Design a protein around this ligand. Structure first.
Ligand SMILES: CC1=C\[C@@H](O)CC(=O)Cc2nc(co2)C(=O)N2CCC=C2C(=O)O[C@H](C(C)C)[C@H](C)/C=C/C(=O)NC\C=C\1
Ligand SMILES: [Cl-]
Ligand SMILES: [Cl-]
Ligand SMILES: [Cl-]
Ligand SMILES: [Cl-]
Ligand SMILES: [Cl-]
Ligand SMILES: [Cl-]
Ligand SMILES: [Cl-]
Ligand SMILES: [Cl-]
Ligand SMILES: [Cl-]
Ligand code: NA
Lengths: 214, 209, 212
């Protein structure tokens, strides 16, 4: 039964900044898994960090489980991109006649969902651009601007984004990905926590094979 | 048709987005019509202009129909320290040190910051002293503009890197020749469908006409 | 001649620029005389030091005569997560998970942030854990200082890019040897014109050393 309640918005005692993200969600098209947290700068909500996010565009921000999201991380959804065929100036917003030129979505450089995997560590003041996919077990350095996709279990950073290194060998990465501990039962996760935490992936692999029954 | 460019808040119900020119209060800031600052929480465009001192006399110049995203910052020449020896500004602290005040030629001043027409500037861009940004350029959010940007190019990063030109040299040459931003508003309103869709062939046509 | 380095606000009418040393209250921070922080809104220098926990024991050391820009942040090692397996900080949430409290040896510590003398640090710079910045350096605004910075060099960008040395390697060696910032103020006052205009040759003479 060990562990915090993922429905608890403020699961750390005395801490008014660190929030479990899922039970704070109020808007639709934001799907965040359990235990993922946002460590706010000054109590702001995770949703306030989601920008240019309009229902009319229908783009989604999707985040998995057990993610660590640092203060000031911002998620720039698709409302940020201007029409780029002619002038970038948005005449229609000003109306008084120009409302005629309200653009159709097909004319916008739309990008699709922001998708973030599980067990992802996102540093302070990272900016995430529209359409970006970030793999399981990634680490994004502070102040990065995530301008392209991020491989699972990789470390990246900078503006624009440079790949830095792989966290483990490809064999070990493959095994973390076949393990998927974040999708296991909490009872199973607790049992395996010492090894999930110390990186004893060989042990985790044996416990997984043991349970196979296949 | 069109909003009044002297309207500080041209969109109804929107207290963040401001036409810049009717907000200008300070000297040496010259901004063209219809250019806007989409503020974060209503702060004024002027207060995004930093280290701007009259005794240096550098200017910030911005053309028409520019989109300036929230948190865009302009760093003027007052930011630069003397770089011959120590960068420490002894004179500021006086008490005898005021006599080490640098002359203007001691300082590495870099001139005016000039942004052209129809430039889209991303959220939280920082602009360095002396930078020239061409018409129709696009500056990606979070960029630190450390060097000049060509007309109709897309740039980004810290430091700034070239990403791509928006069109072929020929079409650009043609937009630059057209200079639609300097037409009368009656003519602009007439030609908006093609300014927006980039039908430059049609634009040359109607303008010859 | 010169201001009182213990005067927190050494410029008349200015409530933003602070001599840093007399504002320090925290352990594990040491900042040299005359170094200043030009705050955005009156915030203190210590408010710009982040993830600094005594139990980790990392130190922030800054030399003398440094110019520190508005918004400059110092990230110490309390931000580092364990990287052996999952980065998720289970122990924080307790309720059984506090038994997974890491040891300091489990954490990827970067050591102290050490900043030399006569350093110019631009606005909105971010300094990462364990970085060393040599004397006379210049860090461009908005830089993220991800690695060590050679003395009298210019750097910038995210991640940090080397730009150029300020002087020839010979002249840098001469500044480094002189260490004007450690000289008695009477001597520094006698030599200010040349410290400021960069005339190292003349500075060398004015000292009149034992090996002429
Ligand atoms: C950026 C910097 C220091 C900062 O890190 C801290 C500040 O910003 C605080 C500040 N600075 C000031 C008033 O508060 C201030 O008043 N400045 C700084 C901007 C011009 C003058 C000034 O003296 O003008 C004189 C003329 C009268 C000849 C010349 C231009 C001075 C130039 C100069 O020495 N640049 C060194 C840079 C100072
Ligand atoms: Cl902040
Ligand atoms: Cl994903
Ligand atoms: Cl391998
Ligand atoms: Cl903000
Ligand atoms: Cl006086
Ligand atoms: Cl502490
Ligand atoms: Cl407890
Ligand atoms: Cl160390
Ligand atoms: Cl060099
Ligand atoms: Na970069």
């Amino acid at each position: 039964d060990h562990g915090p309640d993922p429905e608890n918005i403020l699961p750390i005692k005395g801490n008014r900044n660190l929030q479990f993200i899922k039970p704070t969600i109020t808007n639709e098209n934001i799907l965040v898994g359990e235990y993922s947290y946002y460590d706010s700068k000054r109590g702001e909500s995770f949703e306030d960090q989601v920008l240019y996010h309009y229902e009319v565009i229908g783009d989604k921000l999707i985040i998995g489980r057990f993610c660590s999201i640092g203060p000031g991380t911002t998620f720039i959804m698709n409302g940020a991109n201007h029409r780029m065929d002619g002038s970038t100036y948005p005449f229609h917003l000003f109306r008084m006649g120009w409302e005629k030129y309200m653009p159709s979505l097909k004319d916008l450089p739309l990008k699709g969902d922001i998708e973030i995997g599980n067990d992802v560590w996102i540093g302070r003041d990272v900016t995430i651009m529209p359409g970006v996919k970030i793999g399981d077990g990634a680490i994004i350095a502070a102040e990065a601007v995530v301008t392209k996709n991020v491989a699972p279990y990789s470390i990246v950073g900078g503006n624009p984004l440079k790949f830095i290194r792989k966290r483990f060998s490809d064999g070990v990465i493959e095994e973390w990905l076949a393990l998927q501990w974040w999708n296991l039962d909490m009872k199973i996760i607790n049992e395996n926590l010492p090894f999930i935490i110390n990186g004893d992936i060989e042990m985790l692999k044996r416990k997984r094979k043991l349970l196979d029954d296949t």
